[PDB]
Amino acid sequence: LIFTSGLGFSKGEIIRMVDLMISRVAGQLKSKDMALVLTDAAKALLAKRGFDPVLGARPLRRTIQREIEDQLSEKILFEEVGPGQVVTVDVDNDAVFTFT
Amino acid sequence: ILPSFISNPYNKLFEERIIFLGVQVDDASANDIMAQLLVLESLDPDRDITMYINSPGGGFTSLMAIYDTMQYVRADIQTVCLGQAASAAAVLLAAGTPGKRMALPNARVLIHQPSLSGVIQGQFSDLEIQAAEIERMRTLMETTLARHTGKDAGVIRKDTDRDKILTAEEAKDYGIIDTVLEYRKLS
Amino acid sequence: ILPSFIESNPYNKLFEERIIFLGVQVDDASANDIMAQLLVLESLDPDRDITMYINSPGGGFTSLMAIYDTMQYVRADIQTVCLGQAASAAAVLLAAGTPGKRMALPNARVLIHQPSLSGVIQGQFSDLEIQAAEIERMRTLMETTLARHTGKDAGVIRKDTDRDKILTAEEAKDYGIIDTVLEYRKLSAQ
Amino acid sequence: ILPSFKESNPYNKLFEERIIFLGVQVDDASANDIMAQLLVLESLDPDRDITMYINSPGGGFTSLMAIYDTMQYVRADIQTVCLGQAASAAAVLLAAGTPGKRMALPNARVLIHQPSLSGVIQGQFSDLEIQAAEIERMRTLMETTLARHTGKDAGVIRKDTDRDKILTAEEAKDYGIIDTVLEYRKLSAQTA
Amino acid sequence: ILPSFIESNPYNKLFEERIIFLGVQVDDASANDIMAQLLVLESLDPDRDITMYINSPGGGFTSLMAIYDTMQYVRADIQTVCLGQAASAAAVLLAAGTPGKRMALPNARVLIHQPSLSGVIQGQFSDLEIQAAEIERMRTLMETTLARHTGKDAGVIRKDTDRDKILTAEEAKDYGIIDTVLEYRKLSAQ
Amino acid sequence: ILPSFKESNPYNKLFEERIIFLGVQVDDASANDIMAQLLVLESLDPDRDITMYINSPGGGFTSLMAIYDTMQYVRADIQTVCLGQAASAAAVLLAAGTPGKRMALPNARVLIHQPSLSGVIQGQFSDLEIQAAEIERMRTLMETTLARHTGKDAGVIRKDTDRDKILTAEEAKDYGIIDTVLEYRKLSAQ
Amino acid sequence: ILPSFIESNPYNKLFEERIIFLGVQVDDASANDIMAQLLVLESLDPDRDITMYINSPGGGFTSLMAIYDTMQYVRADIQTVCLGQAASAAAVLLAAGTPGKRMALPNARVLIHQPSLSGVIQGQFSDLEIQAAEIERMRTLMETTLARHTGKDAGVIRKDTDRDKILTAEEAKDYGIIDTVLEYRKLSAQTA
Amino acid sequence: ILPSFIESNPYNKLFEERIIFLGVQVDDASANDIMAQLLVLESLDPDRDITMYINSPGGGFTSLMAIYDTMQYVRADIQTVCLGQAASAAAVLLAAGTPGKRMALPNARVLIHQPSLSGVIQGQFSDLEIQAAEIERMRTLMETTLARHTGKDAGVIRKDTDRDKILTAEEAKDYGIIDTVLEYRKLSAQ
C-alpha cells in the first residue's frame, strides 16, 4: 500500500529528464531515418520554459511538444528536412529555437 | 446616511482592494490604513491595492507611517486623487507606484512646506532642538517629493516655499501623477 | 426615528432601486459616501440609470467637484431630482445630471451664487494673493461647469450669480438647470 | 425606554399598517425620512391610503414643501390626523391631506401664522433686498397653498395669519383645515 | 444599570402584560411613545385593560392633551397607578383613568397646580394679547378636564389650583383624583 | 469595563439569582428600574426572598417612597444588605427590609439626617409657605417610617436626625436599622 | 481599540479564568462592578481562587470599604497582583488579598497616605465638628485595616502614612503589603 | 470608518496573527488593554512570538512600567516594530523588545527625553520634597531600563536624555534602541 499527498513587517538532473522526454521524439525520428540532437543551451531553455518547481515536471511534455514537435513537423512537411539528415536544435537570443 | 446592501459600500470597495483615505491624516487614520494595507497584502500579494485620496492633509509622522507601509508591502499601490490632495496627502499621492498614479479631471493638489500650528514655548536650548527637527522634517518632505517626482530637492523647495496649487494636468506635468482620468460615460 | 420593516429601512430600499440621497451638506463625508454608492451602483449594472435625490443646502467646493467628477465618470447615466431645495453646490450637481433627465418637484427651489469664503484667512499679503487667485479659479470653474451644463455662456452665468439668484422649478427649467417639472400622480386629483 | 415585542417596536408596527409619524420638528432630516417612507409605502401598495400622524411644533419652509410635494405626488391618498398639536408648517401639512380624510382629535390645537425669520441675516442692502423678496415669495406661497386646501381666498388667509392664529379642532374644522373631529371609541364610555 | 440580555428588559416584560410606564417628563418624545404603545396594545387585545404607571413630574400641555386623547380614544379601559408622584400634567393623566380603576400607593403624592410659563415670551403687545388668551384657554381646559374626571365644579378646581396643592393618596381619593389606595400584599406580613 | 459571557453580564446573572443592586443615587431613573425588577422577581417566584444590595449615597424623596412602597408591596420578602454606605434615603430602604433580614457588612456605614433642600426655591411668600409645609410633611413621613421600622419613637428619631448621624454596622444594629452584621463566609479563615 | 477574537474579548477571557480587573479609579461604579463580579465568581465555583489585578490611582473611602468587605466575605480566596501602581485605596485592597497570595510586578509602586478631603465642606461649626469626627474615624479605620493586614502596630502605620509614602515592590514586601515580588518567566531569558 | 470582511475587521485579523497595536497614548486604559492582549496571546501559544506595533507620542510613567513588566514577564518573545514614531515612554517599550527583534521602518522616529511633570503640583514644602524625590526615582528608573536594554551606561543616558533627543531609524540602531531598519519588500522595483 502506497499513499501520497506572515501578515506584515516580518523580515529582520532536469537535463536528464529532458533527454528522457525527447527520447520518444528522437526514436520516432529515427524510424523516419532522422537523428535529433539538442544542444546544451537548447536543453537548458527547454527545462527553464517547461519545468514548474511548484508542479514539478508536469508541464514539460506539453512544452516539448509546443517547441519541438510542432516546429519539426512543420519543417518535415515543408520538405526542408529530408530523410538521412541530422536535425540539430539550437537556441539564439525571449529566446527562440532554430533547426539545421 | 450610508445605505447597506446584500454590506456597506466601503466593505464592497475593500473587497476589491480599494482603500479610502478620505479623512485628515493623523494617528488613527494612519493605523487604519496600515492595518488595511497589511491585510490586503497578506490576502493576495501579487494583485495591486488601489488607494483613493480625498484628504486635506495632516500630521507628518502619520504621513510617514502610511508612506513606509505603502512602499513596504509586496503589492503594487495605485493612487487616485478624487477631489483634493493637500499637504501630506500630496506626498502620498506621489508615493504610488510609478505609472499608477492618476487623478480625476477636476481634482486639486496642494503642496506647501510643513507649518507648525500653535506655539511651542520653552527655553532657547529647547527651541533650537525643535527648529532643527522642523528643518529635518521639511528636508525629508523635500527629498521624498524629489524622489517621486523626478525633480531636484532645490526645485521642490523653491516651489513649496509658499502654498502651490496644481490642477490635475499641472500635477501631471509636475510628476505627482501619471494620468488624468477620462470620463467613462457611454454618452 | 426611521422605522424599518421585513431588516431593510427606507434608505436601503431606495438604494436597491439605484437611488442616491444627497439630503445633507456637501462635505467630505457625504462626498465619499456618494462616490462609494455611485461606484457600487455602476458595478452592479453599468447600463442602468442612477437617480440622485437632492435636498441639500450646498457646501464645500472640492467635495462638489469630486461628486461631479464621479457622476460624470460612471458609465451609467445620472438622473437628478431636486426635492425641497438645491442651493449653492447642490445646484451644480442638479444641473450636472444627464441632459433630458433632470427634474424638480413643482414647489422646489434652486439657488445659485458665486463661491464665498467662510471665515477669515489671515496671513502675509503673498499668501493672501495666492488664496485670492485660487478663489478666482474656483469661481471660474463653477461658471464653466454651469455654462457647459445649462447652455448659457460663462459671462451670463457670472453676471447672474453676482448676487444670490433664486429660481423656482419653472424658472430653473427656463434657465437650463432642469429639463422638466414633475407632475403629481395622485388619482383622486385626476 | 420604548419596549419591543418576530421582534418589533411600536413605530415599526405602525409603519406596517401604513402610518407615518411626523412627531418632530420639520427640517431636512425628518423631511427626508418622511419622503422615503411615503415613497416606500406608495410602491408597496399604490392604491391604499397612507396615514400621517402630526404632532409637531413646525419647522422650515423648504422641508415643508418637500414633504408637501411628496404627499401630493404619490398615487395613494393621504389621511392626516392631528394628535396633540400642529403648528406653523405642520398646519399646512395637516391641510394638505386628501379632502374628507383630514381629522384631529378633540383636544388638538392648530396654529397658523406667517413665516418668521429665525435670527438675522447681515449684509449689503443689495443682498437684503434679495432676501426680503424671497421671504415675501415664501409667505405668498404659504398663503396660496392654504387657500387651495381650505377653500378660502389668499387675502383671507393673509389677514388671518398676520399674527398667530390658534384654533381648536372644531374651529379648525370650521376654518377648513380638517374635515372631521375624531370621536372616542371606548366601549365602557359608550355604554354609559 | 438595568439587568437584561440579548432582550428580556423588565420593561419588555411589563409591556407584554399591557403595562405602559410614564416614568419621565411629559414631552413630545415620551408622548409619542405612549400613544404608539396605547394604540399597539389596543390593537393586540381591544377588550383587555391597559395599565399605566405614573411616576412623573409633569410637563408640556399639548403633550398632556395628546396622551389624554389617546387614552380616551382607545377601545380598552385604562387603569392608572400613581407610584411615587404624579405632579402637574401627570395628575390629570392619573385622574383620566377609567373610573374605578384609578389607584395609588399609600405614600404617593399628587400635585395639582395651574399652568405656568417656562420662561418669557417676548414681542409686541398684540402678540402678548394672543399668547395670554391662549394661556387662559389652556388653564380653563385643565379645569374642565379635572372637573369632568373628579366630579367637582370648574370653579372649585380653579380656586384650589391657583397655588400648588399637594395631596397624599387618601386626600387624592377624597378629592376624586383616584379611587383606591393600594394595600400592601406582602405575605409574611399576614 | 464589565466583562460579559445569550450574552449576559454579572448584573443579569445576579438578577437571575434574585439579587438587585441599589448602587447609584436614588432618583426616578433608578427607582423605576428597581420597581420593574422587584415586580418581575415577585412574578417569577413570590415565595423566594429578593436580596437588595445597598451602596447608595442618597437621593430624592418621591423616588425613595416609590421604592419603599414597592418593597413593602411585593409578596416576596426583601433582604437588604448594606455594603459600603447607606446614606439618607438609602438608610430608610435598608431599614425597610423584612424584619430579621436586614444586614450590613462589618465596615458598612449608615447616615441618617433630616431632609434638605439644596438650592433655593424662589417665589412669593405665599408659595414658600406651601413649600415649607410640604417639606415638613416629608420630614415627618421620613421620621414615621424610620420609627415604624426601628421601633423607636418619632420624637426620638426627629431629635437624632437633627444633624447628620453616622452609624457603624454595630451601632446601626443596636439602633434598629439593621438586625445582624454579616460575618465573613471565607473558608480559609474558618 | 481592543481587538476581539473568535467570540470574546481579552477581558471576557480573563474573567472566564477568574481574573477580575481593577484598572480605574475606585468609585461607586467600579465598586459595584467589582462586587458583582466577585459575587458571580463565588457563585460559579466557591472553592477556586479569584485573581484581582490592581492598576489604579485610588479613590473613595466608602467604595474601598465596600470592595474590602466583599473581598473578605466571599468564600473564594483572593489573590491580588499589583501591575503599574496601587495608590491610596488600591493599596489597602492590595493588602487585603489572602495572606501568602499578594504579589506585585518588579516595577510596581505602592502609594499609601492618609485620607484627604479634596474640596471644601461648608456648614455651621456644629456640622463641621461631626464631619471632622467622621474623617478621623475613617482615618483610624484605614490604619486599623493596614495594621491587621501588614502585621504592624496601628501607631506605626499612622506615623508612616502622615505623608505620602511610596514603596517599590521590594520595599512593599519588606513592609508587609505584599508577600512575593513576581519574577519574569520569559523562556529566552532563562535559557540565556 | 474601518471596513470589515469575510466576518472580521483588520485589527482582529492582526490579533489572530499575534500582533498588538500600540497606536495611542500610553495611559491606564491602553496599558490595561495591552496587558490583557499579551496575557491572552501568551496563553494561546507561549512559544510563538508576539509582535507589538508602536506608533504613539508617549504617555504616563506607571502605565509604561505596567506594559514593560508584562512584556518582560510573558513566556513568549516580544518583537517590536516602530512605525511612525516612538516618543517618550513608547521608545522604552520599543527598546524593551527581545534583543534581535526590535525594528523600525526607515522613516520612523524615536524621541527620548527625561520625565517631565505635566501641570503643577502644589502643597507644603514637606510634600513637595517627597514628590521631587519620587520624580528623581522615576527618572533614574527610566535611565536604568534604557541602559539595560540599549547596552549603554546610565550616566550617558542621563546626559543624552536631558533634552529631547530625536533619533532616526539608523541613529536609533546605532544608539541601541532598535536592531534592524526594515527594508521594503515591494516585488516591483526590487
Curated annotation (Swiss-Prot), chain A:
Protein name as annotated: ATP-dependent Clp protease ATP-binding subunit ClpC1
Disruption phenotype: Depletion experiments (using anti-sense RNA) stops degradation of anti-sigma-E factor RseA.
Highest taxon of the lineage: Bacteria
Family: Belongs to the ClpA/ClpB family. ClpC subfamily.
Role summary: ATP-dependent specificity component of the Clp protease. It directs the protease to specific substrates. Can perform chaperone functions in the absence of ClpP. Degrades anti-sigma-E factor RseA in the presence of ClpP2.
Full-sequence range covered: 662 to 821 of 848
From Swiss-Prot, chain D:
Domain of life according to the entry: Bacteria
Family named by the database record: Belongs to the peptidase S14 family.
Protein localization: Cytoplasm
The reaction(s) this protein catalyses: Hydrolysis of proteins to small peptides in the presence of ATP and magnesium. alpha-casein is the usual test substrate. In the absence of ATP, only oligopeptides shorter than five residues are hydrolyzed (such as succinyl-Leu-Tyr-|-NHMec, and Leu-Tyr-Leu-|-Tyr-Trp, in which cleavage of the -Tyr-|-Leu- and -Tyr-|-Trp bonds also occurs)
Organism, scientific name: Mycobacterium tuberculosis (strain ATCC 25618 / H37Rv)
PANTHER family: ATP-DEPENDENT CLP PROTEASE PROTEOLYTIC SUBUNIT (PTHR10381), ATP-DEPENDENT CLP PROTEASE PROTEOLYTIC SUBUNIT-LIKE-RELATED (PTHR10381:SF26)
Function: Cleaves peptides in various proteins in a process that requires ATP hydrolysis. Has a chymotrypsin-like activity. Plays a major role in the degradation of misfolded proteins. Degrades anti-sigma-D factor RsdA when present in a complex with ClpP1 and ClpX. Degrades anti-sigma-E factor RseA in the presence of ClpC1. Does not seem to act on anti-sigma-L factor RslA.
GO molecular function: ATP-dependent peptidase activity; ATPase binding; serine-type endopeptidase activity
GO annotation, cellular component aspect: cytosol; endopeptidase Clp complex; peptidoglycan-based cell wall; plasma membrane
Record-listed E.C. numbers: 3.4.21.92
Keywords assigned: Cytoplasm, Hydrolase, Protease, Serine protease
Oligomer status and interactors: Fourteen ClpP subunits assemble into 2 heptameric rings which stack back to back to give a disk-like structure with a central cavity, resembling the structure of eukaryotic proteasomes. Forms a complex with ClpP1 and ClpX.
Active site: S88, H113
UniProt-listed SUPFAM superfamilies: ClpP/crotonase
PROSITE patterns associated with the record: CLP_PROTEASE_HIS, CLP_PROTEASE_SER
NCBIfam families on file: PRK00277.1 (NF001368), PRK12553.1 (NF009205)
Gene: clpP2
BP GO annotations: protein quality control for misfolded or incompletely synthesized proteins
Protein name: ATP-dependent Clp protease proteolytic subunit 2
Swiss-Prot record, chain F:
Family: Belongs to the peptidase S14 family.
One annotated GO biological process: protein quality control for misfolded or incompletely synthesized proteins
Broad class of enzyme this protein falls into: hydrolase
UniProt cross-references to Pfam families, sorted A to Z: CLP_protease (PF00574)
Protein name (record): ATP-dependent Clp protease proteolytic subunit 2
Keywords: Cytoplasm, Hydrolase, Protease, Serine protease
UniProt GO MF annotations: ATP-dependent peptidase activity; ATPase binding; serine-type endopeptidase activity
Job of this protein: Cleaves peptides in various proteins in a process that requires ATP hydrolysis. Has a chymotrypsin-like activity. Plays a major role in the degradation of misfolded proteins. Degrades anti-sigma-D factor RsdA when present in a complex with ClpP1 and ClpX. Degrades anti-sigma-E factor RseA in the presence of ClpC1. Does not seem to act on anti-sigma-L factor RslA.
Subcellular localization: Cytoplasm
PANTHER family named in the record: ATP-DEPENDENT CLP PROTEASE PROTEOLYTIC SUBUNIT, ATP-DEPENDENT CLP PROTEASE PROTEOLYTIC SUBUNIT-LIKE-RELATED
Reaction equations catalysed: Hydrolysis of proteins to small peptides in the presence of ATP and magnesium. alpha-casein is the usual test substrate. In the absence of ATP, only oligopeptides shorter than five residues are hydrolyzed (such as succinyl-Leu-Tyr-|-NHMec, and Leu-Tyr-Leu-|-Tyr-Trp, in which cleavage of the -Tyr-|-Leu- and -Tyr-|-Trp bonds also occurs)
E.C. numbers: 3.4.21.92
Keyword Transmembrane helix part of the UniProt annotation: no
PROSITE patterns cross-referenced by the UniProt entry: CLP_PROTEASE_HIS, CLP_PROTEASE_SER
Residue positions of the active site: S88 (nucleophile), H113
NCBIfam families recorded: PRK00277.1, PRK12553.1
Domain of life of the organism encoding this protein: Bacteria
Cellular component, GO annotation: cytosol; endopeptidase Clp complex; peptidoglycan-based cell wall; plasma membrane
The protein's assembly and partners: Fourteen ClpP subunits assemble into 2 heptameric rings which stack back to back to give a disk-like structure with a central cavity, resembling the structure of eukaryotic proteasomes. Forms a complex with ClpP1 and ClpX.
Predominant location: cytoplasm
